[PDB]
Amino acid sequence: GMRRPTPTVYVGRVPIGGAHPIAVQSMTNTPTRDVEATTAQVLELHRAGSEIVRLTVNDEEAAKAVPEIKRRLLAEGAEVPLVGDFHFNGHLLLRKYPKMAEALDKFRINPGTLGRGRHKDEHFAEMIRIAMDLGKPVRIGANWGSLDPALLTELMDRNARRPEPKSAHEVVLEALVESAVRAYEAALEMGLGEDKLVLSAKVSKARDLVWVYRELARRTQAPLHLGLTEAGMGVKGIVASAAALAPLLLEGIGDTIRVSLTPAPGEPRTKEVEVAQEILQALGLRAFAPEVTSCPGCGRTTSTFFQELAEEVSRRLKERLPEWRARYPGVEELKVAVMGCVVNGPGESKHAHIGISLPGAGEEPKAPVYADGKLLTILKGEGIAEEFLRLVEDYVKTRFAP
Amino acid sequence: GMRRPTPTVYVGRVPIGGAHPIAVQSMTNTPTRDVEATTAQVLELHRAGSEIVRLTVNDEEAAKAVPEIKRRLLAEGAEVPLVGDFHFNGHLLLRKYPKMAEALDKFRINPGTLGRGRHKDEHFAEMIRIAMDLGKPVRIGANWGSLDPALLTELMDRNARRPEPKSAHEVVLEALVESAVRAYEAALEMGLGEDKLVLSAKVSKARDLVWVYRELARRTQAPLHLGLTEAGMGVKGIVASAAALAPLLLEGIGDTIRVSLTPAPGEPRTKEVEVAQEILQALGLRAFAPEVTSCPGCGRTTSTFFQELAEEVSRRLKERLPEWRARYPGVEELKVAVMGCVVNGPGESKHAHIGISLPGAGEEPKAPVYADGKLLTILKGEGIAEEFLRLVEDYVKTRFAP
Ligand SMILES: C[C+](CO)[C@H](O)COP(=O)(O)OP(=O)(O)O
Ligand SMILES: C[C+](CO)[C@H](O)COP(=O)(O)OP(=O)(O)O
Ligand code: SF4
Ligand code: SF4
């Protein structure tokens, strides 16, 4: 289950591929024609951790805005790469607005939103030609919400000739993979470099996504852009996204990710970037920020004190991070434990860089603190929380000193 | 990647094993001695979907309370099975309080919290004897927060003799597996039935959990209780839990799950049960409630109207569910789509049972609705939301009629 080798594709300054960290990306939801709102959100997403940012380029007004958005970003020294998302008229917009084409750092094509049969091949070829002329990379991104219907008919007739035809659902997933593979092969044949081609083939159900990506990974050599499309709102969207991605990421499949959450009204667009980072950090693939390991608490602990302490520690680590990031290289790998009682508290604290085990039911009112697998001190009284946070600050300064 | 066969273990009326749905469980956080608070929370957890509920049985006052909690549950016709969580003094509490022993529906033993070496074997044997005498099932639950240190030394010396010794971390994971396996074999040898034994071996990091469970699954025949221990707070705990479980569940490993979230202060203990259900539903393993598939929205849609509609649909489905569950068998499998524009909106809506595709940028102000893969109607004007919800109600009545 080691990382799938792939050629490197640069999206701006960010390399994508088997030799590189899995890159977090996101997409804006502001109208792209609104230069102020869109530039602000691109910066917001980038500051949250979005290494690459996509924006829809849906019409001429959007196309006209892109060079000004890019100008404004550069003016503040924000080197975030921009992906243009094209559907239906990508070939017209790229042809008509060469300054937009040049301002983007990558073009997204969807093989199912090119046009009707004869025109499809030529629309696709025009986009690919422009990308080659400008040295831009392309994502060929299929999505089962926009599956090429002629290809689906071809595969439905192939399936019908089988001694045991597969289900309609299965054929749809075959067709999605085929859509991406065919387009990938067509681009290569036209001369686009392996260093300029990323593929995706998204579906909205986890088990299907796994199947699809295993097929992509086997059939192609490209870096893969992995995501569960239309994952939805709230806890459902978070859970579905994690569930879908983890099996693939653990098998070494995927070179960049996007988490497709529906924000609740008033919820920041940066939530999807947090989720993406948590997925990669949970699986030990990247480290972005200190993490807190804590027990659920049970009838052995005093629920509110323990929950308050864990919350307070997490809050403080988040407040310290900007400073820590600047002073203490490697601090993103910090593991801190906050535990409710003696059953697992010392042991889990010993597995962390530093951890505290509160006293639970039946225990003397003292809280041992462990660091690097051994007892550091024992805390008691009021301000356990502030004392522990001081010990954590001390530990960081020593362990992650430059 | 089909379901691992296992013998069936009944926990109360709930069967656990390869022939049965993966059971959702949880654990209380109230002091077990508080009969009113604990009974209330057991009912709350059970009504949220916890098919089995664990409670700590840490001391004599807790032990004395258990038969009254069980009485109170039965008095309201709540047949929820109770698992007693025992550490350090399990053998003393079960011996001293036979009415507690009989009131429980399953005993949890942790091989690392039995006692010191010589006494450990006898403590374990006493618990197992009582379980056999009463016909109770047992979980032998190892946890790396409470790993038997003598076993770890034995395995550290075995490792040191290897031509290429493994890391200390790797040896810890070996020891955790060995702890569970040895105890399982010991229980079987003493005469406890294969129909009375569930195993777990929990760690707090996802990739390690996968390794551990693949080993358990191979080395034993028991049903497995799967969970990422000490998963933590908030989005991190949710994501880590999903990430850890999905690879295993998709490979067919795991017969019951528990999600080990730390509640934020004032957050209900039922959140962990929601998360558990979302994991299983995301992976197509169980269906608990209708789900909404929605796009993230982008610069093609009007952010707030779309986000409000998706939120409103999700809210309404949740309000209708108790009634629907009673009237319309199978409704838990309902899939509804709410989509932002024409790019993926119709296609994704066609994959749902019923879905709506709002008009995005450039489009006529009309919203097609699809059901069973084909156009049902087209909505326009105000009250699109109420009209769509009426269509969904109509669709449910027809499709899931008894
Ligand atoms: C932006 C858009 C056009 O496909 C989609 O509806 C959803 O975004 P997504 O889930 O990131 O999927 P794509 O990579 O865009 O296929
Ligand atoms: C309740 C308790 C005693 O092990 C733990 O700290 C945590 O609960 P858990 O994460 O469900 O892990 P166990 O199944 O109890 O090993
Ligand atoms: S460490 Fe103690 S308080 Fe925390 S859930 Fe475990 S047993 Fe309960
Ligand atoms: S369906 Fe349309 S509005 Fe929704 S994210 Fe996709 S492209 Fe954007």
Swiss-Prot record, chains A, B:
GO terms for molecular function: 4 iron, 4 sulfur cluster binding; 4-hydroxy-3-methylbut-2-en-1-yl diphosphate synthase activity (ferredoxin); 4-hydroxy-3-methylbut-2-enyl-diphosphate synthase activity (flavodoxin); iron ion binding. Pathway: Isoprenoid biosynthesis; isopentenyl diphosphate biosynthesis via DXP pathway; isopentenyl diphosphate from 1-deoxy-D-xylulose 5-phosphate: step 5/6. Disulfide bonds: none annotated. Binds 1 [4Fe-4S] cluster. [4Fe-4S] cluster binds at residues 295, 298, 341, 348. Its cofactor is [4Fe-4S] cluster. Its EC number is 1.17.7.3. The keyword Oxidoreductase applies. Keywords: 4Fe-4S, Iron, Iron-sulfur, Isoprene biosynthesis, Metal-binding, Oxidoreductase. Converts 2C-methyl-D-erythritol 2,4-cyclodiphosphate (ME-2,4cPP) into 1-hydroxy-2-methyl-2-(E)-butenyl 4-diphosphate. This is 4-hydroxy-3-methylbut-2-en-1-yl diphosphate synthase (flavodoxin). It comes from Thermus thermophilus (strain ATCC 27634 / DSM 579 / HB8).
